[PDB]
């Protein structure tokens, strides 16, 4: 029961990889300490392999089977359809890794018959054969961080023809089943506004609130063949076409349970018997499996009135406190149960009696005040990683714009409004690229977004209070400040000053550009405008957003 076995062949890059922050004319206006920012490369893949390779033991008790029976009972109420070749093709990102069989993501989106002819044959092969392990490519992720140095994460994904077949069999299931099985506990149904509402409401619905986040060590690595067969048995409870049942059975045996790892050069690196990071079912399976283990571990622990919020491997529990030592006892039991279930912790959990101190989906609840003085709650984070990545994206064009995703999801935050919006609107102005659509990743799915729709997207995700927030908390204001001192970012009076400029230049241009200046930078002037609902905002089609997670699922909406 080893997560992985290795041949000794190295995980190879396909293009050269920069580990050091690229510098341009713009870099120093955002960040001075360039030595603090790095990107992970293949060079560290060996250390990741070490970290993720271990023996899993799993001990499964009545709590585990009682929760699973309940989950399957809900799964039975789900009906899911097959997607046609065309539908699945249209879900393929333009930028998506090309097929080994001589065709690419754009050929797939075009419905070019060489692509579609292959896909039909991969599909046919899935129905006929249910035993033959499907090839995966193993690559090192290039992601940017601040030093404190992390090894590259491993992405494992099958060929583009298989990925389109996964969509035909399972897109509708992984879109619809998780909300039916987990109800309000399924995190990816929530906009950031909806998520802060659920957390705060959940917290207040307790007499004596206690909550903790649960950090599983390398959760993909802790997922067993058992866990992956249990997931397929949940999928199989749905009312499915028999062609769909056959495909899900085949993809489970041949791809999801495990299979061989090939590097960029086409050499054999070893064998996987855990979760693939890069398949359609990674989000949904992690979320189901985390919810099953954690739900059963709650019952073991005798946590009273448990509310859970689960996003893939990211887990928050809020429950009734039974005093501090009782709570501390509960959490150790909780941890023993998760360990037996093969989800041992990274940091051991800590009970918390202040909601603002709980981190879940890399975010904490904080509080500011809107126009009318009224307290509004919002999600924020330490902005160290988002700014490190903004620095890197200032000097290199990346196909996913972390800064755009971070503006959309953290729009109400001091740091997103003062730094990210100021910095990136100045760049789009100087290049006159306000009207040029950018790809960004929300809950793993890729979206093409026009920056000039940002005010409308922000009203819909967060409400109009996102444009009027002030009197951020002492503790939020400190963490922003300490991060700027760390990264050598200019102070927030410099950003206010810059934003007055950007605001002025955006109003200059009228149309949506003016709206952007009105709404995004109202905070920068003291003689404030009165901000009121945007007309084009309820025209925006935000169905597809906050339905489901698709991390590593190759999904474009
Ligand atoms: C755009 C980014 C900033 C990356 C966003 C996101 O898409 C994921 C996420 N994407 S994922 O599908 O890869 C995944 C898996 C597990 C946990 C989170 C995520 C994430 O954690 N994010 C930070 C986040 C999440 C929920 C929130 F309400 C708020 C706020 N306010 C902020």
From Swiss-Prot:
Q: Which cofactor does it need?
A: Mg(2+)
Q: Where does Mg(2+) 2 bind?
A: 215, 313-314
Effect seen on changing residue 313 to E/H/N = Complete loss of RdRp activity
All residue ranges annotated as the RdRp catalytic domain in the record: 209-327
Effect seen on changing residue 215 to C/G/N: Complete loss of RdRp activity
From what superkingdom does this record's organism come? Viruses
The protein's location, in the record's own words, is: Host cytoplasm; Host endoplasmic reticulum membrane
| Cofactor note (record) | Binds 2 magnesium ion that constitute a dinuclear catalytic metal center.
Q: How does it sit in the membrane?
A: Single-pass type IV membrane protein
Query: In UniProt terms, what is the effect of altering residue 278 to D/L/R?
Result: Complete loss of RdRp activity
Regulation (activators, inhibitors): Activity is up-regulated by PRK2/PKN2-mediated phosphorylation.
Coiled-coil residues: none
Residue numbers bearing the Phosphoserine modification: 29, 42
Q: Which reaction is catalysed here?
A: RNA(n) + a ribonucleoside 5'-triphosphate = RNA(n+1) + diphosphate
**Post-translational changes noted in the entry:** The N-terminus is phosphorylated by host PRK2/PKN2.
Biological role: RNA-dependent RNA polymerase that performs primer-template recognition and RNA synthesis during viral replication. Initiates RNA transcription/replication at a flavin adenine dinucleotide (FAD), resulting in a 5'- FAD cap on viral RNAs. In this way, recognition of viral 5' RNA by host pattern recognition receptors can be bypassed, thereby evading activation of antiviral pathways.
What does the annotation say about its assembly with partners?
Homooligomer. Interacts with non-structural protein 5A. Interacts with host VAPB. Interacts with host PRK2/PKN2. Interacts with host HNRNPA1 and SEPT6; these interactions facilitate the viral replication. Part of the replication complex composed of NS2, NS3, NS4A, NS4B, NS5A and the RNA-directed RNA polymerase embedded in an ER-derived membranous web.
Listed name of the protein: RNA-directed RNA polymerase
Instruction: Tell me the organism.
Output: Hepatitis C virus genotype 1b (isolate BK)
